Design a binder for this molecule. Structure first.
Ligand SMILES: O=C(CSC(=O)[C@H](Cc1ccccc1)CC(F)(F)F)c1ccccc1
Ligand SMILES: O=C(CSC(=O)[C@H](Cc1ccccc1)CC(F)(F)F)c1ccccc1
Ligand SMILES: [Zn+2]
Ligand SMILES: [Zn+2]
Lengths: 152, 151
């Protein structure tokens, strides 16, 4: 697997709205390869999530992978949409692979309901709670051109 | 896979693309990116393409001259760098997949270019005429410049 270089704060790739994955790209070796390189890069940097823009790819693909932090199976999400944010809020320390040695506290929704496509192109809707929810929110923020430092 | 192409107005096209790292050379990832760029260029009837045009902010281009012009084999260039521009200029009709306006643009008639192959071999070559325009156009994409800004 390839470990990819990661963009840092100050690079404007992080400030765009990433383009949706088109229909022809679903279930393609192009998309599987992209996701595998993201995944490998996330593991090599000890991240618990990653977004394509952070590897210079302005496409709506994220990975949510909470691990020590509670432990989940990693989930790849293509064109994710948060359909509902809870009004209940949780605060917690966040970091970012794109913002080396800078931590802060961000208020996030405690639960989100998210609709996304798998790499094959199947639609799934999943509710996230707690730390996994914060990860989803942070990564969707990356796809929209927002760093966490802007929500401190 | 035919990739969607960004259009003039989208910021992805104005960035300075980031160099491809050593780890990506000779990887299934890179070959797959180049294949997808190549297929996209063909489906849109282009003679070149640069990764930023398919939402990938990386310094990869293809140069693929053919009539409607010399016929060449498609060359994939990683981290290309123009080492020299001739002071001799030449004007030619250009179009762009991202500006779907044509225009008459002045280019260096000759360029000397260094790049990496997909396998990681470092290579140097000179281009003349239309292939040299194509190279200049695509390197401009890597530095956030569209041909309409040169008119
Ligand atoms: O490994 C990190 C480095 S940063 C990280 O994993 C971000 C994900 C994240 C961390 C904490 C809260 C929400 C999201 C990844 C980014 F920036 F690549 F998306 C980590 C930070 C805090 C707690 C546990 C682990
Ligand atoms: O299909 C086009 C439209 S554009 C095109 O192929 C651009 C490449 C180009 C064409 C002509 C001169 C210089 C560059 C592609 C771009 F934008 F991706 F780089 C075409 C134009 C002139 C000659 C042959 C074909
Ligand atoms: Zn981040
Ligand atoms: Zn162009």
């Amino acid at each position: 697997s390839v470990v990819l270089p990661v963009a840092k704060r100050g690079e404007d790739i992080l400030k765009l709205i990433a383009a949706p994955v088109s229909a022809n790209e679903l279930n393609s070796n192009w998309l599987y390869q992209l996701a595998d390189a993201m995944h490998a890069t996330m593991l090599e940097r000890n991240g618990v999530g990653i977004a394509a823009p952070q590897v210079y790819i302005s496409k709506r693909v994220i990975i949510v992978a909470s691990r020590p932090a509670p432990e989940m199976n990693a989930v790849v999400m293509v064109n994710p949409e948060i359909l509902e944010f809870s009004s209940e809020m949780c605060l917690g320390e966040e970091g970012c692979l794109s913002v080396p040695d800078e931590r802060g506290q961000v208020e996030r929704a405690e639960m989100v309901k998210v609709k996304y496509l798998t790499l094959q192109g199947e639609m799934v809707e999943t509710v996230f709670q707690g730390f996994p929810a914060r990860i989803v929110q942070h990564e969707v923020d990356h796809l929209n051109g927002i760093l966490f430092v802007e929500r401190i």
